[PDB]
Amino acid sequence: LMQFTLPVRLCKEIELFHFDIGPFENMWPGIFVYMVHRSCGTSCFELEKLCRFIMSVKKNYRRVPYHNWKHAVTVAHCMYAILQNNHTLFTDLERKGLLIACLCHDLDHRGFSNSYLQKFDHPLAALYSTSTMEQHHFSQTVSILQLEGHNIFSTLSSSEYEQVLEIIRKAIIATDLALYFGNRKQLEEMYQTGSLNLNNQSHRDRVIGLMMTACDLCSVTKLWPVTKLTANDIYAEFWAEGDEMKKLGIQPIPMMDRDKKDEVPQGQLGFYNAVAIPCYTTLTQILPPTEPLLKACRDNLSQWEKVIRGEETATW
Numbered sequence: 128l129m130q131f132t133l134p135v136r137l138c139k140e141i142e143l144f145h146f147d148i149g150p151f152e153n154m155w156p157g158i159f160v161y162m163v164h165r166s167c168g169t170s171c172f173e174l175e176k177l178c179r180f181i182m183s184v185k186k187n188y189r190r191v192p193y194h195n196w197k198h199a200v201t202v203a204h205c206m207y208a209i210l211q212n213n214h215t216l217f218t219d220l221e222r223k224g225l226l227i228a229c230l231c232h233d234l235d236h237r238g239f240s241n242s243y244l245q246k247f248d249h250p251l252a253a254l255y256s257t258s259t260m261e262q263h264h265f266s267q268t269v270s271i272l273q274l275e276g277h278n279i280f281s282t283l284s285s286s287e288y289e290q291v292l293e294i295i296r297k298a299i300i301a302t303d304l305a306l307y308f309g310n311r312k313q314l315e316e317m318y319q320t321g322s323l324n325l326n327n328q329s330h331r332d333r334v335i336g337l338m339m340t341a342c343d344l345c346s347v348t349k350l351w352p353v354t355k356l357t358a359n360d361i362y363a364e365f366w367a368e369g370d371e372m373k374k375l376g377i378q379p380i381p382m383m384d385r386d387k388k389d390e391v392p393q394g395q396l397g398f399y400n401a402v403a404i405p406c407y408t409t410l411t412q413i414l415p416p417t418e419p420l421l422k423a424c425r426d427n428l429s430q431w432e433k434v435i436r437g438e439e440t441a442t443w
């Protein structure tokens with residue numbers, strides 16, 4: 128049988144949460160196939176159909192500084208590290224579904240938030256009033272699955288197929304950060320009152336939603352030099368959206384204003400405190416083997432504090 132392999136440094140480092148997939152774009156499909164085979168087995172997909180699916184997904188990602196193909200594969204790797212560190216918790220269907228959801232979660236992203244679509248009066252905002260881009264990303268995912276030769280789920284019953292596309296739909300909708308706050312608040316209550324039950328489908332959903340936020344934000348869990356350079360890509364998108372807000376005659380929030388770069392360090396502190404730390408804290412309480420994400424997140428907050436106090440500087 129045909130079992131994908133990696134050079135020794137990659138074969139080992141890929142098991143770690145802080146793995147960087149590197150600058151060689153033509154290696155990323157091989158990295159993804161490798162992760163699926165070790166996460167779900169050589170059986171769970173027809174390799175011809177998989178590679179065809181991957182290459183069409185790649186084609187429907189755009190040339191944007193942050194929400195691109197590299198990000199898709201990076202987010203899938205985080206989900207792979209979480210699945211491999213908790214191999215006993217997830218069904219055969221959830222493992223298959225979640226690596227696909229991660230690869231597809233940002234399909235056809237143009238570097239703009241839901242707010243900008245609503246202020247621009249984009250057509251997708253008429254089709255879907257909430258989680259605008261995220262419902263688009265999912266309907267893109269369904270389209271690629273319905274292309275001739277791309278149905279990587281072709282061997283499932285009508286029943287399992289519907290279950291796997293409901294896992295993918297909810298997984299992709301949960302990457303809407305507006306939904307994250309309430310989702311994590313409810314999980315924190317259910318954990319502390321001891322009512323959280325992984326056998327309750329409704330509880331599993333919320334838990335899978337937190338994992339998707341954790342994987343989506345995973346650039347804050349890398350080593351500082353990777354985190355620091357990804358920050359330049361994130362703000363490159365943010366500043367372009369701020370410029371497009373000014374063209375509609377709207378003053379953008381300061382974090383989207385390229386005239387307020389000075390405020391980024393303090394902005395990153397807010398983000399680590401209000402979003403990142405709480406996210407990996409709750410994920411670690413529910414899934415203890417995910418502690419390294421929280422630890423790497425705390426290390427980077429401590430690096431942004433160093434930047435504020437002038438003992439360290441980011442050029443951007």
Ligand SMILES: CC(=O)Nc1cccc(OCCCOc2ncnc3scc(-c4ccc(F)cc4)c23)c1
Binds near residue numbers: 344358394
């Ligand atoms: C105090 C406070 O609440 N701050 C606060 C709250 C809410 C969002 C907020 O964004 C701060 C901008 C830095 O954003 C980021 N900063 C570092 N890493 C990453 S990885 C993904 C994002 C990312 C995050 C939000 C997106 F909409 C789009 C991508 C991101 C900051």
Ligand SMILES: [Zn+2]
Binds near residue numbers: 194198233343
């Ligand atoms: Zn994403």
